Design a protein around this ligand. Sequence first.
Ligand SMILES: CC(=O)N[C@H]1[C@H](OC[C@H]2O[C@@H](O)[C@H](O)[C@@H](O)[C@H]2O)O[C@H](CO)[C@@H](O)[C@@H]1O
Ligand SMILES: CC(=O)N[C@H]1[C@H](OC[C@H]2O[C@@H](O)[C@H](O)[C@@H](O)[C@H]2O)O[C@H](CO)[C@@H](O)[C@@H]1O
Lengths: 171, 171
Amino acid sequence: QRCGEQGSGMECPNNLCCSQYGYCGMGGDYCGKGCQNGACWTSKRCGSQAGGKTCPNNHCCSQYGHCGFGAEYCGAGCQGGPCRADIKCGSQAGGKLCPNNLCCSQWGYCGLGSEFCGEGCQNGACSTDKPCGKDAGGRVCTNNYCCSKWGSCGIGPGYCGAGCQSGGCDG
Amino acid sequence: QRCGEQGSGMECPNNLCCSQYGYCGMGGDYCGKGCQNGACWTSKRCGSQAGGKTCPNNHCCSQYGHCGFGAEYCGAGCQGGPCRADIKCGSQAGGKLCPNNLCCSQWGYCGLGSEFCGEGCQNGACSTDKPCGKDAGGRVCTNNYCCSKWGSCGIGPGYCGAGCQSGGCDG
Ligand SMILES: CC(=O)N[C@H]1[C@H](OC[C@H]2O[C@@H](O)[C@H](O)[C@@H](O)[C@H]2O)O[C@H](CO)[C@@H](O)[C@@H]1O
Ligand SMILES: CC(=O)N[C@H]1[C@H](OC[C@H]2O[C@@H](O)[C@H](O)[C@@H](O)[C@H]2O)O[C@H](CO)[C@@H](O)[C@@H]1O
């Protein structure tokens, strides 16, 4: 039930702050210093500024490299997160994957939902379980996912460790 | 380390799916049946169509009532989440409070960051850190947050336990 690094990059619900010690809360003692994610009083950085660092909880990374929400962050300049502008990807965008596992639609704009993740889905969290491996033309997955021994893409012990054909397998 | 019911509302980072057993990952196993939050394959209800239960992971709640990210969700109709339209609030909007602990700036709009949580903040995760209770004027917190012994508004055991003057005093 721990957050921050004491829960392995896990996050608190309803925008709650994960204090320096790994607990979910809201208050100066959670959102102050040490805060790891949530509505941290001093917004975490990201993007070009932060060598590419992406914002937790799907916060928009404004054009200055600060995570938040509203006009100033998700508006124009938005570097990442749920921007107000459509995000290109795939063949249209040069193989350009979507960030934060978002699905890249048939039409070429990241998102999540049957629209992006279903039929046509070209990369990201695709609900269409496509077959990978020897029993699938020797195909390999998107996003550098682990192609399971039973020929399916995913992340976690089943797909990544013992059995994993091609992908981010440990061994 | 654990999510859903076995984590305390906890969420996986980068949209990872949280299976019914309380574990984080991606793949038919985690993203399928029993998905608790994350980039599910089985997109969750919200707003009007769901008794008003916002989307986890900060997804936009489309007009039709399903959780996602994309022009179809965040865009027109958007009932909640990082909508592409400004969500009014505070003294202006009849007194309304922001959704998912969002800060309501001085101008009457929902967001998160200096601009919203800095000065002028009417409700939510406001960093203004103003006191409460007996200690000064006897004022009480926004969002039913708990007010600690040394009059500090917050949520957690140290604000809601003993010496909690007003709010969600967990005691
Ligand atoms: C949106 C954002 O990243 N805000 C940052 C802020 O960025 C500086 C930026 O602020 C705009 O509002 C101004 O219009 C622009 O000219 C710049 O001054 O930087 C502070 C810290 O310096 C952050 O707390 C904000 O979140
Ligand atoms: C954006 C959204 O909520 N998608 C839902 C989907 O609702 C789509 C919506 O499409 C309109 O064009 C139709 O007029 C309307 O009847 C709806 O079908 O609903 C499915 C399942 O009901 C969900 O999987 C999507 O997430």
